[PDB]
Every structure is written in structure tokens, then in C-alpha cells.
Amino acid sequence: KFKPYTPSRRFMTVADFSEITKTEPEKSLVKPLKKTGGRNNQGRITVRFRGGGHKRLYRIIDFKRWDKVGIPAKVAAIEYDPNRSARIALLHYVDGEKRYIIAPDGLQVGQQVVAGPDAPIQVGNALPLRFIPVGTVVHAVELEPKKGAKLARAAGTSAQIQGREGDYVILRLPSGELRKVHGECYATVGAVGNADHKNIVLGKAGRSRWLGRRPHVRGAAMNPVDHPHGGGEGRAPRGRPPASPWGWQTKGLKTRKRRKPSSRFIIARRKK
Amino acid sequence: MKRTWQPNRRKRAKTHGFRARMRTPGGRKVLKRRRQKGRWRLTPAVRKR
RNA sequence: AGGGUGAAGCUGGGGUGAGACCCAGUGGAGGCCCGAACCGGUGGGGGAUGCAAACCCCUCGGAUGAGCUGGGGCUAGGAG
RNA sequence: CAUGAGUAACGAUAAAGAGGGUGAGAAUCCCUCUCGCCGUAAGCCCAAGGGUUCCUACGCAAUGGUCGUCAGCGUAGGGUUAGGCGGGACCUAAGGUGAAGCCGAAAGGCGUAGCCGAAGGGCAGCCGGUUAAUAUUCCGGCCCUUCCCGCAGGUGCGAUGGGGGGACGCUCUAGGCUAGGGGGACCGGAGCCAUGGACGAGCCCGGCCAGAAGCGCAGGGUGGGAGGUAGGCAAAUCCGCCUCCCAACAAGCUCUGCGUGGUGGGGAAGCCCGUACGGGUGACAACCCCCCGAAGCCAGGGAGCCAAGAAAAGCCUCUAAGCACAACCUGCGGGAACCCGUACCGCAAACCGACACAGGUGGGCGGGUGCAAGAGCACUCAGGCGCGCGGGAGAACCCUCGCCAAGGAACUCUGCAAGUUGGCCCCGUAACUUCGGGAGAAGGGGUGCUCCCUGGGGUGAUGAGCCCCGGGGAGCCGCAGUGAACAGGCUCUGGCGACUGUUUACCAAAAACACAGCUCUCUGCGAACUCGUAAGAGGAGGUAUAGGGAGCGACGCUUGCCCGGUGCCGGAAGGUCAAGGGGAGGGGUGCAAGCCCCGAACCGAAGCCCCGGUGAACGGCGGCCGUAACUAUAACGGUCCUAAGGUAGCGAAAUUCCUUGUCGGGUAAGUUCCGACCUGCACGAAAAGCGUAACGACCGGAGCGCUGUCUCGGCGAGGGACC
Ligand SMILES: NC[C@@H]1O[C@H](O[C@H]2[C@@H](O)[C@H](O[C@@H]3[C@@H](O)[C@H](N)C[C@H](N)[C@H]3O[C@H]3O[C@H](CN)[C@@H](O)[C@H](O)[C@H]3N)O[C@@H]2CO)[C@H](N)[C@@H](O)[C@@H]1O
């Protein structure tokens, strides 16, 4: 029920460089799931470019485990949703009920794993940080206990356990930074399920992108009647500005944001 | 040649009606205004069927 | 409406260790290719108080996709 | 109220001519007879929307673009009725409302819940007959629907709260049934040879449609238990988790074919009569046989592929609590069932454009012949017409369309146009290439119809039952054999751009913008922005492979020189200043304690200065002078200047004004383009630079082909012009 990434159509005219992926569980989801409105327009004013749609399923997923902190679960199997950067495992809880959950590193259908008060540090179970075997990996992870799985490292194979101090453990998050969460808080054990996805290649843009749902963006689009920047000519403007009365693209946003100093440091950057 | 007309028993009837006018304050207001300021009636009455 | 194209998988036959990979049959995917209904509307032509407050003709592009379309709705006018 | 004007014009070049009729008058009404155009629509059909009108009877002074005894016109009267069609008496999404709640100077903003709110859900009938007129609504035949009263048999019955459940892409697609095509000389029938012929498997007409369920084709939708039954999906045997047996092409329970009760219809002519709307009409039928079949139906299939496809009845399943003695499941009898709806127009003179405007406007085969296939083609079936002003000769000339020869672009800014050319089958097919392809390259050749020998996929084996090519052979007639209508002109080459596209409704088919894919860079989610007066939503039930700002824009090679100024990014040591904290001190009034000012030594926020950082960040990347045996530049030869001073490729280009630059090619000649050169008036990598196949209604340069296009064209047909 894993999934092929690479399959690429071939020379079926410019449908060139189209990357397929196929989870093998292929089953159509199950019983627990509604749908999302057609947002893009919202609070009934309209906003943010692109946006279009394309077919309609729509998710409900588990984001909180302490709610059975124990009932082993066995991979119902693999599958996913018209959302999320890295598929899911519909899991079965030994008590009858099941739940759509993450999809860490390639686990295995039928596999038993669970979590709570002491779970075996086997990628799959989840645990209050504290049970953090420092130097290990998780994601999903949530600071401010109860505030549900906060930091759903999307396909975000990224929760790197980095030491502890006080009632907070240190973590290396996607981004390339290190924050802190009080141990009692929690983490889904292990890592994500998708990345190659991230590399996926798609053919005739219009076709693909739109299918994605998203349409466009078109800067200093000539007639700068608005389009912040210049136009009514070839030449790329100067000032150094962006759409809807913008600050270019090299300035802050944070602030006192009591948030900030409160934890984390590394400051915002990487260097591949 | 989509000369924009082509009404809809529904749509038009719909969009506009006594109710509706009384709903929006502007609706109501204009209502009375016209109504007794100069007689007539109310197209939101104009309706058919 | 209709017609051609002819990938991937597979099945078998072919060559190493197995394998690559080949050939053949199957197949019959979106791009699509050809071309009506459908949707656009140059290229030339025909009206100037014209069938018409934007037309008729000969013609031409897409002709499963960011396609076309009836019904039901929300955003609106220094706002969309 | 005049004026061109009694000229321009009548709404489509889909033609009409006759006879009789009725009339005060009939090109322009009625019948009937010749005749053309639709037919895939000028068909019918549902729906929308119109809302009179529809009919029947009188009438025409207004109205139709004149007519007019015609009407959709005027006057009057009559005309659509349904437990089972539809919609509500039910369900719900988006979506509006909104008891709560959060929120505004006010008016309101936001809003769960419950509600309103759909040809999206769900639900019980069909066919034959009857009116001037409406119909599965009426009549009749046939088939049911729930709800109420009862009774008869049967049960833990008994919410709508838990659950299971109805529920769902797209592409495609096996198997199975009517629709629905089609030949039956196959049976019924009213007739015929007119004309050289044939009365002969001749023509012409028809040879069904509905039918409880009973039943026979297809399939169409799965598990029996038991127990554990640490979830339950709060409340309990119903689901789901674990386990041991039976888990059978299993019995299961939901549409077709026959049924057949059985009813009903049943058409040609034909000729009798009404204007017609019509009717008798032949027994009145014969109503059987064989062929082809779908995107329809069974069916929620079945495969494959992602971009991975809605919420309320029904079956159960327990409280409430009644039930359980009168609750539910189930037969028979009895009795009930209301509200709003049809007329007709309705791809269009009744719906939308102010007009009987040739514009537009949603789904239902779309009869037949032929064509390889087919709603395109040509002629037609039914069914629909004949556009509503007429007759007339027919000269100018615009229109529409036809033919040419001699030459075949010189016309011309442009081969604008138009002609060439085009239907399938076989021979065959270039530089280049992302080896997908450019190929319908390109260039040939073919087909018609006869008779003859020869193989095939159909259908109950398979034998008048059909579709595929056969294959080949001899031969037949035309200038001619996709014989008419559907139907590529072509090749070479260059700039741009990738290619699919959207737009510019009102010139600007097409670059621009898309874009896939590049890089910078922004944000830690109560992210960052976008609207908002808070409230709040949005964002994202997403959660830095993620969500934003951006210049570019497949891909290939490749992105170098400066951050001294500008913005932005980093550090407040220091200089620097608002309010403030503030007190030295001066001050007016104070007989006086006092009351009150001004007040400024010092501390004092970002910012600003200052110091680094900094281009896929604004934005820029030079000037001059000298030297290698001689005659020509090239190397630094040091200097003036600044932040350095433009690399790689590139060049007279969608940037060279001197320019029709100079050479070269093309050419009788060419400021045109292709190639060179390169002293680049004023290219350069990121608003990309050089290149780069495929693809353009791209724009430009060749050349073969063809053609009243050009040397003038010349006659010709159809329409106005003209009487
Ligand atoms: N290594 C240098 C190589 O040669 C050139 O260098 C250039 C550059 O460096 C240098 O530029 C310098 C700059 O001070 C400024 N532009 C003024 C100065 N006159 C100039 O120098 C010039 O004049 C010099 C004295 N009369 C001579 O050495 C020579 O003619 C020339 N270099 O001069 C060269 C030409 O402008 C190429 N540009 C480069 O690509 C290549 O690598």
C-alpha cells in the first residue's frame, strides 16, 4: 500500500515530465468524513489569487492521542485524502473504532503500534515528549499540551529531538530552527511518509496547476493601474514593491510577539 | 443575442418582493417614499402568475 | 455524431545470473491527429436612414479540457 | 406643417401556374389539381417564459410594412377538472434565515441550533376510445397507492436520538433484453396491364401496442453462528475490534422475455360526402417469419487511472416508556384521500432585441437511400412550407454566380482573393530529432461496371438467411469511372514565442498575459498577508516538501564585474531628539503661612547619523596617452577618473541614423530577406543572454503547382436599378 513516485508518462505530447504515484491500498476511504465549502471567497469578501478546486472528497483526521492512550492499533492499512502532503493510514483501534492517522515512515499494514503513558519508542507509536529518547524523530508534535497535534509536519519529515531543559524539550523543526515544548506535550513517533511527492513533475501547466485547483498570479502585470509595480511598458520597475500595497520581500513580520523569545532560537534560515 | 433581457418568473420574481424590500432598510425606506410620496404601488408587486 | 493514432501495464516467444533490455500480441491512454452538433469568432466579401444599437456569406481555430452547457447561489459598482 | 419623394425602401433569390368556390371587391381567403424548398430540418416533444389566447359564431372603419369578404385583428359566447403526471402536504448542499452567543455612535456586522430554501434526494399507473376545443386528468379495459375503522392471524412492540444505509470520479468496457432499423411474395386487401414489352417470387398497404403475475431467458445488488462483545457510535442483545466452527458456479431479497387473463387499435387505395377540424371506409383485416442492433435498460456491473467522486426516508436497533392486551409485523372486509396546476405559442411573427425584426435561448431517435464511418454531404419519409406587396420588359452599373483563351503574375505594398488542391487503398517518405516526430512530408498509382475460377468473420449445426475483404482472371463502355454533394496546394527559409490556452465585449487570431518549470525572499502557525468599526472570517481542519511577495518563464549551454549612493538585512558603543520623570533656578500676586507660573543640570522610544552586511535587490559596468628591425592594428606602457568598469555567447538585428554600410547569395535586374564582416548612432544574462525539435488563422524572404488575377478582359445567369 506504499506508492510509486517516478512513473512518468512518455512523449504523449508535451504531457512530458508527468510524475505518477500510486499508494497500493487503493481502497476508497471510510465512514468518517464530510466535505469543505468552496473557500477562496470567504467571510464573503473574496481573497488570494489562484484558487479553483477540482472534484470533491474532504477530510476529518485524528490529531489527538491521549484519547485511548493505549488501545493498540493495527494499521487498518494505507490510503489518503484530497488533502495533506503525505498520505495516511486508516488505523484500527483494537476496541472496534478506527481513525485516520498520520502515515509515518513506511510502517506496515496490520502493524501494531499505539501510544501514551510509555509507548515503545518504535516509529508509529506516539508519546508525551518527555518519553523523548533525545536524538530520535517524530512529527505531528504539539507544544502546549491538549492544544492538539500542533505542528503537523505535513509530509514534514522534520521533528528532530534535540536535548532538553526545564519543562521544555528542544526540537529542530522543518524550517531549520529549534523551538521548545513542555515535555508532557506530545509527538507522533518517527517521521513522515512523503517527499518524493515533493519532487513530482507535472505536464502542461494549465492542465496540471488548474487541476491542482489553483489558477494564477501575474505581477507588475502591465497596466499597473494597481499591480503595485510598474507597467504600461516593457521594463521591470524599481521602487522595490509588491501587490496589494506591499513591502517587497526582505523585511520582518514578527514583533514583541511575546511568542518569539518565549522559545525557539536558530533564527530563520538554512543552507543547502 | 443575449440582449440581457430574458427574465425569470423565478429569478426576477425572486430577487424582488415586498418582503425583500422591507428587509433592507434602504428597501423599506424607498418603499414608503415612493409608495405614498407618489402613489402607484410597487413593482415588487409587479409580479405575475 | 463520426474516424485515425497508436504509449503504460500485461501475456507469450528471445537473449544472462537472475536481470537488463528485444521482439511480438494485447492494449487501446488526452495529446490527442482528422474532422460536424458545441465553442470561438481572423482572412477576404456583402449592408451603410442596412434583417440588426454589432449582422449574412465564402472562409477559419479548438473540436475532453485550464472543454461547453440549463437550473440554483455569493462577491457591486472608489467596491467588484 | 412642409422637404427631398410620390424616386429609397417591404425584412432574406426556398419559384410558383391552373380550375372551380364565396364574396360589394378577392395577386394577396376556401377546396381541389399541376409545381419548387425543407427532412435533420423549416421535425415533432418536455421545459422556459408569454400570459392571452384556443375554439365556434358574427364584423373589418384601426392592425398587418397596400391588399384583404384573411388573422395570432374587433364583438360575443364556450373552452383546460388528475389518490396514482408535476409541486407542496417529506429531505437537504451550496445557500438565506436565524432562539443562543460574539460583536456598532446608531442604523448593523458576524451566527450554532431548528426552519426556509433544488427537474440534486425520494414517491403509489398504463393504454385504447370521446369533445369546436382539454386528457395517463373524461370514458372504458386492464394495475396499484398510503391513511383511517374494524375484524383475522403474528410479535419485547415502542423513537428518531447511536449505528448500519441509501452514496455517487473520470476513461473505458464483457454479458443480457425491448426501442428501433431492415428483406419476408409471408398472409390479409382495394386495384393495374395503359402506351414495344411484363399480370410474372409485379407494384401499392399493412403485417402491432398495452397485459396481475404465474411463469421461462439475463443478470443486476453476499456471508450463518456462537461467544469474548474491557469501542460502544454516552444509556441495552443492533454496528466495529478478537477467537472456534459452517462460511458451496449457495437459498437470498430488487428491473427485462414470455405471459397471457384480455382489451384495444388495426391502412393502404378506394370512392360519398365537410372549408377544413373530418368520416365512412374490405372481410375489415392479415397482425406469423428471418435479418441488423445502441451512448438505453438490467445494474448500486466489471477493468484501468488519479486530479482519488453531497447532506435528510427505508431495514433494522434499543429509551421514552408504554408496550404487552390492546404498541408494531402481517391478510380480508369496510371506509378515505384536500391545496396550487392542463388551452395554445412555445429553435419561435405569441419567449428575449422598442417592429409579422434572417440575432439568442436548455435536454428527447433525430424516418430513408446512397457515401468506408458518421445528426456533414445530394434526393427524399412522414410532417413542414411557398418568407406576403404584385405584372413588366429586361439597357448603365454594385451586388451573387459561370465560362475562356493567348500568356500565365508581370497586378499588386502584399498572389488580398480566387482557382489549385483535396473521398479511402496500395507503391513510397527528406535536413533534423527532446527518437514522441516531424508524414495527410513528399511523389506514384488506384478505383466504375460485366462474367468467370478461388479464401473469410455471420446466424439454432448451419442449406434461398448477411456483413469483411478476398484474391485473381478475361473483358465492357465513355475525355472522362470519391463520376453530383460532402472534401490538403505545396516545398524551402528566417525573427519571435515553446507547444493548450484567455482577452482585447466595440476594428485590433495575435503579441501580451498565462504558464509547467528558475531564483530571491516572507511566516511559525491563535503563522504571514486580504477584507473587517471591533466582532470575524478568511487563511489552513493546511500546518514550512507547507501557505504568501515576487523578476523569469519548456529544455540545452550558461548565468561574470561593482554594493562608494538607494532600499533591505545585522549591531544601539557612541552623537542625536517627543512625551515624560523633572529640579537648579527665575517669577507675579502674597502684609504673611501661601497661592499659583516660567521652569530646565541629568535620566529619557523608535527612529535618524554611524559601522558591517547586501543583486534571479534599485541601479549602474568607463575616459585618455605610449612601445615589439620597416608598411596595419593587435599584448601593456604607465597614466586622468570612478564602484568597478561588462565575461561568455551576440551584432548593421520586433535596437546601424551615416544606410538602398561593405562583401557574398539570391536576381535580367533588389534599399527585400539568408549568409558573412563587425568602427555595436544606443546589444549583454535575469524585465534573462546564445541556441533550441515540435507546435502559430504568428510577421517577413524564396521557389514548383495552379488560377480572368494581371496584360483591358469578352459574352453569360441570377438581384435591384428602369415602365
Ligand atoms: N585581463 C584583461 C583582458 O583584457 C581586457 O581588459 C580590459 C581592462 O582590464 C582594462 O581596462 C583598463 C581600466 O583601468 C580603464 N578602463 C582604463 C584603462 N585605459 C584600461 O586599460 C586599457 O588601457 C591600457 C593603457 N593604454 C592598456 O593596458 C589597454 O589598452 C587597456 N587595458 O583594459 C582592457 C581593455 O579595456 C579585457 N576587457 C578583459 O576581458 C581581458 O581579460
UniProtKB/Swiss-Prot annotation, chain A:
Pfam families assigned: Ribosomal_L2, Ribosomal_L2_C
GO biological process: cytoplasmic translation
Domain of life: Bacteria
InterPro entries: NA-bd_OB-fold, Rib_uL2_dom2, Ribosomal_uL2, Ribosomal_uL2_bac/org-type, Ribosomal_uL2_C, Ribosomal_uL2_CS, Ribosomal_uL2_dom3, Ribosomal_uL2_RNA-bd_dom
Subunit structure: Part of the 50S ribosomal subunit. Forms a bridge to the 30S subunit in the 70S ribosome.
Family: Belongs to the universal ribosomal protein uL2 family.
Function: One of the primary rRNA binding proteins. Required for association of the 30S and 50S subunits to form the 70S ribosome, for tRNA binding and peptide bond formation. It has been suggested to have peptidyltransferase activity; this is somewhat controversial. Makes several contacts with the 16S rRNA in the 70S ribosome.
HAMAP family: Ribosomal_uL2_B
Entry protein name: Large ribosomal subunit protein uL2
Curated annotation (Swiss-Prot), chain B:
GO molecular function: structural constituent of ribosome
GO BP annotation list: translation
Region (Disordered), start-end ranges: 26-49
Composition bias type Basic residues, residue spans: 29-49
Alphabetically ordered keywords of this record: Ribonucleoprotein, Ribosomal protein
GO annotation, cellular component aspect: ribonucleoprotein complex; ribosome
InterPro entries tied to this protein: Ribosomal_bL34, Ribosomal_bL34_CS
Subunit field text: Part of the 50S ribosomal subunit.
Any further remark recorded for this protein: The open reading frame (ORF) for this protein is entirely within the ORF for the RNase P protein (RnaP). The two start codons are separated by four nucleotides.
Function of the molecule: Found on the solvent side of the large subunit.
Family as reported in the entry's similarity comment: Belongs to the bacterial ribosomal protein bL34 family.
Protein name in UniProt: Large ribosomal subunit protein bL34
